[PDB]
Amino acid sequence: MNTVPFTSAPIEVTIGIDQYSFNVKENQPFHGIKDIPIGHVHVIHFQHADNSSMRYGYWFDCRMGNFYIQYDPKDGLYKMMEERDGAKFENIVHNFKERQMMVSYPKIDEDDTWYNLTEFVQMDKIRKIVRKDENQFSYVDSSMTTVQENELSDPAHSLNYTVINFKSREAIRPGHEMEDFLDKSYYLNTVMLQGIFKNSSNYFGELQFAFLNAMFFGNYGSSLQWHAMIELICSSATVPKHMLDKLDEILYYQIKTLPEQYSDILLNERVWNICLYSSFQKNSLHNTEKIMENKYPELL
């Protein structure tokens, strides 16, 4: 198990760590989060009590370095930093653990929710969507725009998701206009899977990362990307059988984890009704269709 210590908590804030969120009071004694499961990426995120504008946070993997949080009173946010002095870090963490100044991430002999939400997400691919090569961790917030969003303004603060556009020359072979528009299989399998992502694991990784940024930060461009990647699969008549089965599991856990009160803004009626009821794969998402119907029968 690993740890993300905090220098302090000078301002009142709601802190998220993966799917858990909790509160710390202004100048309430607090030195961070222990017992973080090794082997997964993680996200630690923040919403200030005094200005709920801007949710922001950091994707990280404790295997890649020793990371801590420190409030910056000039830039007014909690910043992640890497400590290169390994013995200094262990000793700080030991003092905080002895004094019981760190909240415990849940252990639980049963849960797989975080694994299921991050199964294909790797830090290395995150760092290529979020370009800041001097840090081993990646910052995302509510307001960051995507490359495709910018085509339609600061490039260094952008989410470089793979651009998907169904009415584009990349998507449509000359001479196969109707074929390729009505059946996106060549765009999915040749252009995206073989060409760009190389395999379905990397595709699912970006899909999962896009969902998590939409959910945790209310990042609108990430929500667009998540829906586009779902639509591209459901709108293909020819999809490898293992991809369809895995997609059903992925979306099931994403729909299970979504706050019921955020569904109005986080779910696109058109895409979901088309995917569950009209598309080629309308009969291939049994688990997802069942949870959607029992939890959000209104949208449909």
Partner: protein
């Protein structure tokens, strides 16, 4: 965006534009089979592609052989239309290519947009006008060339005859839309109006009769009365 009554003079400015109507592309007769089921038989159709400023009509005849062995023909027909319009644009010299294409039915937007990806600067627009171009097949010379076709064929017409020698495009388009609306509402009576007087003929190189300015006023008034009449007969007014 969409074309409507508020931006109607835009049709007659100096930016080349074409209307595309796909109504008559896929045409069928529905009949009974020996077993008492219902079947369709296709007949030749046409794409109606019209420059409203000049009157130039690019009538692409759609021969029934296009549909042989194909499924979902009403969907195919939209993509075939878009394929043929794109082929027409590519065949035109650059300075003759349109800057906008206005489709009369919104279901043509995506097929045409996809076929015209190579032309990012040509705007594809819907319209909220209810234009009566489906009645093009009530014009005898257009109907005749479509039905006689034995192969795909493009035939070029000026749908305004020589009217632009005496009237503006705005007025010519209004006359055309009135004639076509009348032919659409009561074809028999409209044709009776147009041919009542045997001393008014259709020139070999024209589509409509050679009416003098005063006879056109008479004709146009008779067409308006017809449309209002049928609107009465229809709604009991």
């Amino acid at each position: 965006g969409a074309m409507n009554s508020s931006n109607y003079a835009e049709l007659f400015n100096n930016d080349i534009k074409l209307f595309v109507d796909d109504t008559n592309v896929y045409r069928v007769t529905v009949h009974k089979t020996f077993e008492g089921n219902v079947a369709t038989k296709a007949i030749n159709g046409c794409i109606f592609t019209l420059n409203p400023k000049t009157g130039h009509l690019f009538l692409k005849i759609i021969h029934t052989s296009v549909w042989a062995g194909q499924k979902r023909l009403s969907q195919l027909a939209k993509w075939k239309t878009a394929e043929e319009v794109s082929a027409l644009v590519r065949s035109l010299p650059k300075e003759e290519q349109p800057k906008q294409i206005i489709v009369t039915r919104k279901a043509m937007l995506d097929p045409l947009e996809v076929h015209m990806l190579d032309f990012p600067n040509i705007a594809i627009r819907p319209t909220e006008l209810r234009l009566p171009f489906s009645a093009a097949m009530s014009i005898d010379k257009l109907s005749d060339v479509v039905m006689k076709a034995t192969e795909p064929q493009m035939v070029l017409f000026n749908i305004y005859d020589d009217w632009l020698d005496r009237i503006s495009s705005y007025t010519a388009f209004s006359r055309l839309t009135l004639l076509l609306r009348a032919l659409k509402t009561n074809e028999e009576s409209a044709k009776m109006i147009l041919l009542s007087d045997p001393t008014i003929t259709i020139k070999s190189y024209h589509l409509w009769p050679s009416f003098t300015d005063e006879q056109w006023i008479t004709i146009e008034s008779q067409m308006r009365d017809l449309i209002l009449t049928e609107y009465g007969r229809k709604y009991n007014v």
